[PDB]
Write a protein that binds this ligand. Sequence first.
Ligand SMILES: C[C@@H]1N[C@@H](C#Cc2ccccc2)[C@H](O)[C@@H]1O
Length: 439
Amino acid sequence: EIPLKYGATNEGKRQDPAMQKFRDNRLGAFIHWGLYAIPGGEWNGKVYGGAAEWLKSWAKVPADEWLKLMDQWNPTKFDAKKWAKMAKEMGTKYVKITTKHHEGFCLWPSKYTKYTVANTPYKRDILGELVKAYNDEGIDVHFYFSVMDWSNPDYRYDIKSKEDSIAFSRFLEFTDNQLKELATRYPTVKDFWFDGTWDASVKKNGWWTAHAEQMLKELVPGVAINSRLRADDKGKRHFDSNGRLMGDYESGYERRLPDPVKDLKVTQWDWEACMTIPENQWGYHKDWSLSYVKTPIEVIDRIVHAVSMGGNMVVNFGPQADGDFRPEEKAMATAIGKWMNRYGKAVYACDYAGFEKQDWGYYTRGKNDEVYMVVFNQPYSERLIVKTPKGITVEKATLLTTGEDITVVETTRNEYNVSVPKKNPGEPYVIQLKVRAAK
Ligand SMILES: C[C@@H]1N[C@@H](C#Cc2ccccc2)[C@H](O)[C@@H]1O
């Protein structure tokens, strides 16, 4: 056992109503919008295949020249009420917004830097408009914040001198100022999701990460803080040197997910995954033909996968420079929305069911011990295998959409065949089980 000043604080999972809400929400959308949307992956006539929001890096653009894009920031089609309506219709319960990405341009008019929305043709507080619009739809808002900042020359990648240490100390104060500003300007915020915390400079300054967490929790009652912020005394990130989770939820599953058989450890803490639609594009990229683009069922599979293992999922969108969404993203949101409207009782407010994974799909467990079978892979056998934990029996099965009764046949002690529906649903579908535990 190691002694630590800046390690974990939470015992197990938070069970206050604010965390229960963060959890129960389950499905969110991510918005990556920044100056990178203007060039859209292309610089000086060359299209780069890397993530469009990192184009400054790929094309080696100096900060002064990158930040001049502010002069073209004029999203005339932007309408926050329309954005919120799109998120509502998708069935998202929350949205995570890039308040500032690595480029350093702020979507709110920060008083601590000139690189903000206020100094663009458009002038308006985008972020404030979004907060208000989403909240009006009953949709929680979470703020993405990049610690790394390519616009501020006090940023350091590592501390190699006393000069570096002085500069970086200023940078942290500047960061604290932006954070307090966001918290006090927009007090309905439910979560801060830190990114760009991987450099040695941050790892060496664990104390600050713990401080940022406590500071924001004092300013916003019940606010959530992601693990990715946090580093301990020894520079160990996410989980401290005694294996304990820092922050309120685990936040490392990015464009990947834990294995449903081998990574059951994740059910012991709250966590959230995020994903892109193309292979690796978060900001708007002009050419989606350059990598594989997921279909709606592929996205829905990942969402349900997350919930089945006790985690949330956040699907990313990268709005155009003009403030509208591309057609592929509108189609996706609409498709997800249709399916969630029909089957979302197996997603919202659900969790890990404690059953052995089977090949047909995923189990989720409801708040009143409902066990849902979410079927993505239809067996030619016409039988869905259900192996129960010790002491649990299956009393009934019901097709969720129609209420029709589904035959259940005991095959062995602790195992059943649940029939497929008489008519093939023709899409991923849900069978609800009634289970009983021995007494
Ligand atoms: C949520 C995503 N995190 C950002 C990143 C990254 C990254 C950078 C270097 C190596 C591996 C991952 C992406 O640009 C996006 O914000």
